């Protein structure tokens, strides 16, 4: 119930275009265009790459669970249940739900039976895809591959895969699909109601606190 | 078992058949009114149903033990087995189901019909006695669930309807002290002979000997003989269980067992 309803979509978009995420993707695009029109070190480099990958996740259409997806779902639930939403609330809260929801996240690049995972904090791993045992990392290869290959939002990160595979023995298909962040197998595991996945999903929902 | 007991009886010795859920009780659903009027407004008595291995009794009082001494109304039901059982595992529960919903029941002689509207109180200080020739062989005072009767031919269930001294407004409204009595207090017991060991032969639920014998007698329209009742109605057969009738029943049952050994 509301009489105004004067394009709340447009009102939200107006303040959304100016959020840090919007100007950040604009600056990323501008920087790439300028590069075209021109002519712990590992932890720092991976942190920068992680920020860029967060921007890429916002920009593009990923087939994984895509942390931004969970952020939007939590935002929708909170908005629907909350009963205090003025004219200038959905604007300037959809922006915040874009900014601060899940500040820390990780991404994956799958490659020829191996996986290279990165974190915005600075963490970085690389591990075989059939049996989860980490292998030596190659930051130069990762920086090469991140620009072209598709990135898998590590909803279920390697810290959790190791525990889950080691304790709850998983099949190759389910493990591969969890690595690919397949919603089918993620919802299958939550339907099974196993504590590791339940705990991690609750951790992310808590991280959406703002 | 049947031929073994046949030999043991032909050379006089202690027989015995293990029965799951024997039909020891002749079928009888009835009621006795220890207080009544032609108006049938204020009644007190006991309804019961004996059937197969099940007994249900329900002592009811329409005044809920007001004029009675000590606000405690005594109820007693006697079931007289036609044969003595042995080592009988007996379930005993409160709240006889079949006499706990409203009914309209014909009078003692069918002349009229009276309304019964139970409100189930808890039967307090219940006492189930198992008697052999008048001697108390076993007794159980307020101990529901599974129990055991060592050796008995009569069951004496003595339960009570105690008016609840403390009463919330709802139950207080349910039980007035004036005449109308629109709700009738009731306390019930249920008693199933789950298994037992009988010296003589009876129908069961585990066996089909009575089924085979009566089916044979019904296939060929055998004329009614002297001792067995028409159609071998088990109720009429067990109500009067004279020795000659028992002997013929044992003979036909063992023959039916010998047949069922091969013909199923």
């Amino acid at each position: 119930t509301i009489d105004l309803t004067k394009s709340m979509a447009t009102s939200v978009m107006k303040k959304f275009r100016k959020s840090k995420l919007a100007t950040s993707i604009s600056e990323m695009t501008n920087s790439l265009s300028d590069a075209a029109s021109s002519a712990n070190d590992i932890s720092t480099q991976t942190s920068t790459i992680g920020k860029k990958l967060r921007l890429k996740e916002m920009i593009t259409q990923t087939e994984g669970m895509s942390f931004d997806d969970i952020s939007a779902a939590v935002l929708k639930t909170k908005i629907d249940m909350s009963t205090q939403i003025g004219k200038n609330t959905l604007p300037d809260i959809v922006t915040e739900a874009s900014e601060k929801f899940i500040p820390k996240r990780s991404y994956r690049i799958l490659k020829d039976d191996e996986v290279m995972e990165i974190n915005t904090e600075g963490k970085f791993f690389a591990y075989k895809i059939n049996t989860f045992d980490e292998v030596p990392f190659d930051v130069n290869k990762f920086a090469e591959l991140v620009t072209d290959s598709p990135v898998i939002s590590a909803i279920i990160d390697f810290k959790t895969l190791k525990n889950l595979n080691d304790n709850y023995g998983i099949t190759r298909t389910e493990a591969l699909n969890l690595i690919k962040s397949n919603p089918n197998m993620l919802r299958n595991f939550i339907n099974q109601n196993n504590p590791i996945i339940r705990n991690r999903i609750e951790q992310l929902i808590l991280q959406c606190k703002l | 078992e049947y031929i073994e007991n046949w030999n043991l009886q032909n050379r006089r010795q202690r027989t015995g058949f293990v029965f799951h859920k024997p039909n020891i009780f002749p079928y009888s659903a009835s009621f006795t009114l220890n207080r009544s009027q032609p108006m049938h407004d204020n009644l007190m008595g006991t309804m019961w149903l004996n059937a197969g291995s099940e007994i249900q009794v329900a002592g009811f009082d329409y005044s809920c033990a007001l004029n009675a001494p000590a606000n405690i109304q005594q109820f007693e039901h006697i079931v007289q087995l036609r044969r003595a059982l042995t080592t009988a595992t007996i379930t005993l529960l409160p709240d006889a189901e079949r006499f706990s919903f409203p009914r309209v029941i014909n009078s003692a002689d069918g002349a009229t019909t009276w309304f019964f509207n139970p409100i189930i109180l808890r039967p307090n200080n219940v006492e189930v006695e198992f008697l052999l020739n008048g001697q108390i062989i076993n007794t159980y005072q307020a101990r529901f669930g599974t129990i055991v009767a060592r050796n008995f031919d009569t069951i004496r269930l003595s339960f009570q309807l105690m008016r609840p001294p403390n009463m919330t407004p709802a139950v207080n409204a349910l039980f007035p002290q004036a005449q109308p009595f629109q709700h009738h207090a009731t306390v019930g017991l249920t008693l199933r002979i789950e298994s037992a060991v009988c010296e003589s032969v009876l129908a069961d639920a585990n066996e089909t000997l009575l089924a085979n014998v009566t089916a044979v007698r019904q296939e060929y329209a055998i004329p009614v003989g002297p001792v067995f009742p028409p159609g071998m109605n088990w109720t009429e057969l067990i109500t009067n269980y004279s020795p000659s009738r028992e002997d013929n029943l044992q003979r036909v049952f063992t023959v039916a067992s010998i047949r069922s050994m091969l013909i199923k």
Binding site: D3 | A142, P164, P165, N166, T168, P169, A173
Partner: protein
């Protein structure tokens, strides 16, 4: 003691329930009779309170436990009726044209209303649901309610014009006004005289009984018209002599107290919910 928590409790059915408690609820509690002054006017006595006390003592209640209260008439007793007293009976004579006043008083003193103040001058007041009313008490409660559109504009009434408002109670001592639950309203009520409280109906008050001394079953505690419940404590007795009425009460005081009960909100066990 785990006050303020819904904690489930398990109770068996083989347990033999304990002995009576009438002697406790007499030797401890306090019976409390509220009668109209016309009763004493017809009795024409004045040792009679003492005589009734002695008869109650014969029936069980100790001397100081049975206490009597007078009131000029039902409509005057209606204004702020607070029964600060342990087991309440209200003798209530019935006369024509006081049916609604009797019903209002019966509802008010039989059901536990929890309620908050109302600044008529400042806010617009809306009724939540089925169990919310506004009770106005005073010497002259002339409530004039003007409903409001979704734009806060009057319909049938002009917010600046008190005259076109819709009256729903004129000079009533007590008025349980119920409006269309879902709409903002602007009230006007004579603030110097009559107070108004936004009240809502908790469970029943199981501590107060009403003995309608007169006619037919006319009490309707439930403002809903579909349901006309007959509560246990809305007793009714014929009358031609106040002595006979009081003797009936004295004789059957055990039954009346059985119908009533200890006030739930007065118990220590209700400490951190709405204890009063």
């Amino acid at each position: 003691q785990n006050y303020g928590l819904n904690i489930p409790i398990t109770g068996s059915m083989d347990t033999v329930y304990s002995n009576s408690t009438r002697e406790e609820v007499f030797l401890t509690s306090t019976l409390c009779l509220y009668y109209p002054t016309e009763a004493s006017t017809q009795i024409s006595d004045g040792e009679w309170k003492d005589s009734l006390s002695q008869m109650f003592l014969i029936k069980g209640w100790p001397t100081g436990s049975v206490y009597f209260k007078e009131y000029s008439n039902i409509v005057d007793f209606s204004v702020d009726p607070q029964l600060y007293c342990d087991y309440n009976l209200v003798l209530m004579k019935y006369d024509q044209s006081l049916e609604l006043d009797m019903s209002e008083l019966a509802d008010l003193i039989l059901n536990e209303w929890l309620c908050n103040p109302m600044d008529i001058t400042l806010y617009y007041y809306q009724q939540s649901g089925e169990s919310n009313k506004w009770i106005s008490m005073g010497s002259s409660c002339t409530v004039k309610v003007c409903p409001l559109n979704t734009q806060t504009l009057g319909i049938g009434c002009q917010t600046t014009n008190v005259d076109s408002f819709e009256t729903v109670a004129e000079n009533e001592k007590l008025a349980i006004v119920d409006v269309v639950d879902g709409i903002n309203h602007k009230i006007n009520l004579t603030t110097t005289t009559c107070t108004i409280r936004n009240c809502k109906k908790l469970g029943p008050r199981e501590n107060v009984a009403v003995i309608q001394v007169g006619g037919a079953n006319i009490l309707d505690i439930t403002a809903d018209p579909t349901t006309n419940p007959q509560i246990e404590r809305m007793m009714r007795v014929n009358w031609k002599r106040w002595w006979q009425v009081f003797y009936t009460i004295v004789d059957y005081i055990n039954q009346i107290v059985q119908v009533m009960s200890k006030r739930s909100r007065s118990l220590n066990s209700a400490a951190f919910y709405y204890r009063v």
